[PDB]
Every structure is written in C-alpha cells, then in structure tokens.
Amino acid sequence: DPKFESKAALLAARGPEELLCFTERLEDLVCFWEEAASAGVGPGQYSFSYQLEDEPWKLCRLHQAPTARGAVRFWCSLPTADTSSFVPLELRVTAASGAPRYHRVIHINEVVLLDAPVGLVARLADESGHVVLRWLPPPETPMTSHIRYEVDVSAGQGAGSVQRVEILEGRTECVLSNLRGRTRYTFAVRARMAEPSFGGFWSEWSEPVSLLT
C-alpha cells in the first residue's frame, strides 16, 4: 500500500513516533505506530481499543508490516461506520502485559491527509499574458469547498528556487501576474483542509507542470 506507506512516513516525520492517525477521504481512518522490530508476538503483542463518545469500547484488529526503514509498523483501519467527523474518538493501545502504551483523543476531521491535487495545467491568460493555473482537487474527496491549496512556482536562468502562493479554500485556480518574461516556469500544488472546521497536514505535491513565458 504505497500511498499509505508514504503517508505514514510524512507523519512519522512531522508528528511523533506516538500513535498517528489520519483520514484521506473523511470516510476512513487508520492509526498506526512503528517500533523496533522484535520477534514473534507481532499484532498479538498489543490490543487496540477505541471508543467514540457515548458508545461502547470497541477493538480494532491490528496488522503488522515491514516499514521500508527496517522497523515494524502496527496499523488498524477503523470500521467505516465508526469514522464519524466532529465526534471525540478515544484511542488506547495496550501491550501484552496489560500496560498502556498510547492514549489519545482525536477528532477525525482534524487529522486529514489528503491525496495530492490532480490535473495541474498552466495557460497564458486572455490578452493579459498572465499565467493561469488550474487543477483538480484530490479525487473522490468530499468537502472540497474546504480544501485550500499552496502553489509552488519555480524557474529562471538556472535560478529556479521556488516561491509559495496560498490559495483560498474551494478555489482551484491561481493567477500569477508578476512572473518574469521569456522564462520557463515549473509549478505544483499541494492540498490540506482549512481550519477551524477541519485540520490535518499538507498533502503530497501534485505532478508538476512547466510553462514558458
């Protein structure tokens, strides 16, 4: 599961080796943690329990995996019926001995890691000569009206060293009118949910697009 693997890598980086959880399409949730590969007693080594506010404590079958680092990641994918946004989700991981390892309380809508935007295209505006950037939001994702973006624009005489433009949520277009003439530029977009209704971490950058001014 490349996408999940690569995403769990971002969180491992940005966040803690603690219990990390993230939703991609708001109708899902996976929590996981990595740990110094041991011996036997894999997923059995622990019990992952969760409880959505006002409901009974449930268990979530754990899975073990070979993290492309040399360690082992334990992960659980919440049953879809329990992936409710805006409701306190208490998570708890217990080791074989019965001792608590992790204790978190999250809100699914605040841990979203979106797939990267798709279909990035760059065109020279209508008689303005400006660059108009258009793209599609992460596929199969709801609440697109709440997805803001960040554009990376780089290029120049072997001096292409970026610049970042923040795009309003719901907007999938960006107008650049101060770009240097006769210059081959390269742009890319990344997505993330807008606060305060939502929260999360930057998505992967979209495939790039080059344009000559």
């Binding site: 708001l26 109708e27 959505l52 506010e53 049953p79 879809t80 019926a81 329990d82 992936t83 409710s84 946004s85 805006f86 409701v87 709801p142 609440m143 009206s145 709440h146 209704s197």
Partner: protein, 166 residues
C-alpha cells in the same frame, strides 16, 4: 454568531448529498431489499404553513427526537444486514455512512442547542404519539433518511443558526 460547524452549509450538505445518493441507489432495489420486519421511523413531512407558525422551540423537539428515532432505525437496519447472506451489495456502504453521518449530525445538533431545547420544550405531559410510521425495505428507510435531513433538519438548522445577541 454562527453556532459553529453545523451552521456551515457545506458541512451539513455533505450528509444531505450522501442521503440523496443512498435514497437514489435504493430505488433500483427490487426484491433484494426487505428489512424482513417493520422498523419504526420518524415522520418527515413538513407543512410549511403549520411549521412557520409553531413555537420555534418545537422545531427543536421534532428534529432532535426524530433524529434519535432515525439513528435507532438505521442501527437496527445495520444489524439486520449483518445477519444473513441476503442480496443487495450496495446497501452496506450506504448504511455505514448513515450510521456514521447520523452520529456526526447528532453531535452537531446538540452543540446547536437542539437537545437542550427539545428536552425543555418537551418537559410537560402531552398527547400519545398518535402516528407511528414504519418501513420494511431499505428503500423506504433511505428515502426517509434523505427527506428528514434535507427537510425539517435542514429547516430547523437554517433558522437556529441565525442567532446573534438581542
């Protein structure tokens, strides 16, 4: 000021569109969608003439309690579905989204003050339910799910959100 999260149309709309798809998809049900029993559901009709004339607090009563009954109806549908190797492959996800969505809406409504208002406006003895609507197919269950959220729920939420200070 906008009573947070549910007062954001797009936030509530996510569920209304989910319900529409659920309802739409269950129209091609056939004989593969019986609940094999009568599941009590709320009444979703709204008489706009009577609706805008009744004490606003009563809107709260109707929606909060109706939603509660709805949640129970869907939960029952979920367990009825877990049992058997019965047909209709599409049913599962729509039910999981409904259970999930109804759970979010319930939390969302309370923050809006729906549960508080509903309990007080309903703290005096009244006349027997005198109604009792039911469904025996997932089709009616989902149609009711959509009509309720897009109906009195939306209506109640729209008015309640316009609440500054006076």
């Amino acid at each position: 000021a906008p009573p947070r999260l549910i007062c954001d149309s797009r936030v509530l709309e996510r569920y209304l569109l989910e319900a529409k798809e659920a309802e739409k998809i269950t129209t091609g049900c056939a004989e593969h969608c019986s609940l094999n029993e009568k599941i009590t559901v709320p009444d979703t009709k709204v008489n706009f003439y009577a609706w805008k004339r009744m004490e606003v607090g009563q809107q709260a009563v109707e929606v909060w309690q109706g939603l509660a009954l709805l949640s129970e109806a869907v939960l029952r549908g979920q367990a009825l579905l877990v049992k058997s190797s019965q047909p209709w492959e599409p049913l599962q996800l729509h039910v999981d989204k409904a259970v999930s969505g109804l759970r979010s809406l319930t939390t969302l409504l309370r923050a809006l003050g729906a549960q508080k208002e509903a309990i007080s406006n309903s703290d005096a003895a009244s006349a027997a339910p005198l109604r009792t609507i039911t469904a025996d197919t997932f089709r009616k269950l989902f149609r009711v799910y959509s009509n309720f959220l897009r109906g009195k729920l939306k209506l109640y939420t729209g008015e309640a959100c316009r609440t500054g200070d006076r």
